[PDB]
Structure 1
Amino acid sequence: TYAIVKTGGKQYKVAAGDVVKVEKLDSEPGASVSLPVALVVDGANVTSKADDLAKVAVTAEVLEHTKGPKIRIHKFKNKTGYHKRQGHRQQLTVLKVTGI
């Protein structure tokens, strides 16, 4: 069995035990969070009705807070002399799914 969980404006296909990187959540490492579900596929029958989805939720534990890859931005335009250096490291949380 597995389910599609919505978090941070995106959806991820997860089952029990999967580790998935997720947009930053205000939770301390080692805590537990409950997230909505966009679809449940248990064996063969597929749960897709809105109220059935509302009746279910996915519980996962926060592993650690991490950072994404370093992204270098150097905007540039020729015959202009315009440069603009900039960096960015997106913050992330690592979630281990406990059950559905």
Structure 2
Amino acid sequence: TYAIVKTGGKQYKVAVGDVVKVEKLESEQGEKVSLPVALVVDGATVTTDAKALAKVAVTGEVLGHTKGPKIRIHKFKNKTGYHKRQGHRQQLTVLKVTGI
């Protein structure tokens, strides 16, 4: 069985025991989180309905906080003398799916 869990403005197809990198959640390491779903497939059933899905949530455990890859930006235009360097490192949260 598996489901489509919605979090951080995105959706992920997960099963029990999966590990997902999602957007940062204001939750510390170790405790549990419950997330809404958009679809649940349990073999031949899909349940495809807002009312039935709104009473089902997946439970995950925060495994920790990590960072995305370092991104280097150097904006440049042809004959202007214009340059602009900039870096970025997105903050992420690692979830271990235990619910559904």
**Structure-1-length-normalised TM-score:** 0.99
Task: Give the aligned partner of residue 6 of structure 1.
Answer: 6
**Structure-2-length-normalised TM-score:** 0.99
Shift of 1:45: 1.1
Shift of 1:4: 0.2
Task: Give the aligned partner of residue 61 of structure 1.
Answer: 61
Question: Residues of 2 paired with 1:15 and 1:52: CA distance?
Answer: 19
- Aligned residue-pair number: 100
The structure 1 segments of at least 4 consecutive aligned residues displaced by more than 2 Å after TM superposition are none
Unaligned stretches of 5+ residues in structure 1:
none
1:21-100 equivalences in 2 (<5 Å) = 21-100=21-100
CA RMSD of aligned residues (A): 0.5
Structure with greater proportional strand content: 1
* Contact 2:3 2:39 (8 Å CA) reproduced: yes
Percent identity (aligned): 88
Unaligned stretches of 5+ residues in structure 2:
none
